[PDB]
Design a protein around this ligand. Structure first.
Ligand SMILES: Nc1ncnc2c1ncn2[C@@H]1O[C@H](COP(=O)(O)OP(=O)(O)OP(=O)(O)O)[C@@H](O)[C@H]1O
Ligand SMILES: Nc1ncnc2c1ncn2[C@@H]1O[C@H](COP(=O)(O)OP(=O)(O)OP(=O)(O)O)[C@@H](O)[C@H]1O
Ligand SMILES: [Mg+2]
Ligand SMILES: [Mg+2]
Length: 311
């Protein structure tokens, strides 16, 4: 059955406005940044040292306009980059993340140092602060602080990064109504992720996969069901058998890492099976005569906000 109207209704329910269109997200972002700015002055004052400063930039889905609302009991995810005014060769990357952790000591319940960011957890959302060294002071590269406290020397590094280049690639892939379909299809699959996975890499992973493999589908209108079917099939086509089935997807800018690499062999096998089931549901929605049956098939994978008309 034709299901484009219901996909567009679903899109309206799941979409979360980007930073430039969302005063609440800007305010919450700016609240944590001020907490970092004020905290650094105190931490360093208390050591009788000059505080480092930083330049923030928007990152992640709320920067790229690929954001979704969480399900009840899920969290918003505010991604921000902070570029510290330091030479990467003067500081251990873990020690620079400790500055940020210490700055936020007294903010909500404080912050957690993770492999790739410093996270502040609040009721119903967290703020992931990616921590970078200054490119000019560091020899011209923008490097992110990798590693956890008490991590071995091999598991901490200043890793070459290109967050602006990634955002530019996502923004420039398509334009106008074609780009709108691309963003809708990323959002649909994020809600699928949230509904069908009890999964952290799937956000970036699905976005990078869409960059490589998304194709517009339009005739008498945009055909989101068909664009998803082609995209899901293409993702499945790109699994390879190592030990078991894996999908390896390079980031399309430095450092060209596999954005799915954190997933275990079993998580990848489960991922593939859930993509197969989604593909069948997309095919079923096309072939079903009754709109009710087509939409029920989709709601089984996209969840309760996918509208299922009566009859
Ligand atoms: N290369 C990256 N650039 C920017 N931000 C990143 C990068 N990798 C991860 N992040 C951010 O860090 C968050 C958490 O990923 P991270 O790798 O730090 O997890 P973790 O909790 O330490 O687990 P693990 O150590 O097993 O990977 C992501 O949601 C994202 O916002
Ligand atoms: N594994 C990774 N490799 C490279 N860059 C990463 C990785 N994980 C995160 N990032 C970077 O950090 C940003 C924020 O990470 P996060 O996992 O929150 O994804 P996202 O694009 O914001 O999607 P979501 O809607 O799921 O939060 C990504 O958009 C990307 O720029
Ligand atoms: Mg995010
Ligand atoms: Mg995040």
């Amino acid at each position: 059955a034709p299901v484009q109207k219901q996909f567009r209704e679903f899109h309206d329910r799941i979409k979360l406005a980007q930073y430039d269109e969302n005063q609440t997200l800007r305010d919450e972002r700016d609240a944590v940044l001020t907490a970092v700015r004020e905290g650094l002055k105190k931490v360093f004052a208390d050591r009788g040292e000059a505080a480092p400063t930083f330049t923030p930039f928007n990152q992640g889905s709320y920067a790229m306009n690929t954001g979704v609302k969480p399900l009840e009991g899920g969290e918003y995810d505010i991604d921000v980059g902070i570029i510290l005014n330091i030479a990467k060769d003067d500081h251990d990357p873990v020690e620079v993340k400790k500055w940020i952790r210490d700055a936020l000591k007294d903010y909500g319940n404080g912050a957690e140092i993770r492999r790739s960011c410093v996270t502040v957890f609040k009721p119903g959302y967290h703020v992931d602060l990616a921590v970078y060294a200054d490119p000019e002071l560091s020899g011209g590269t923008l490097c992110i602080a990798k590693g956890k406290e008490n991590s071995g020397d091999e598991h901490r590094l200043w890793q070459i990064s290109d967050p602006q280049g990634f955002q530019d690639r996502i923004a420039s892939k398509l334009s106008g109504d074609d780009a709108a379909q691309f963003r809708r299809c990323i959002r649909y699959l994020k809600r699928w992720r949230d509904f069908r996975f009890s999964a952290a890499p799937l956000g970036i992973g699905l976005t990078a996969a869409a960059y490589w493999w998304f194709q517009v589908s339009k005739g008498s209108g945009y055909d989101d069901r068909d664009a998803l079917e082609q995209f899901v099939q293409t993702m499945l086509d790109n699994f390879h058998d190592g030990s078991g089935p894996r999908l390896t997807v390079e980031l399309p800018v430095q450092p060209y890492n596999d954005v799915f690499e954190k997933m275990t062999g079993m998580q990848m096998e489960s991922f593939k099976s859930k993509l197969q089931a989604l593909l069948n549901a997309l095919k079923t929605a096309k072939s079903r005569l009754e709109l009710h049956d087509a939409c029920k098939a989709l709601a089984d994978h996209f969840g309760s906000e996918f509208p299922v008309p009566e009859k």
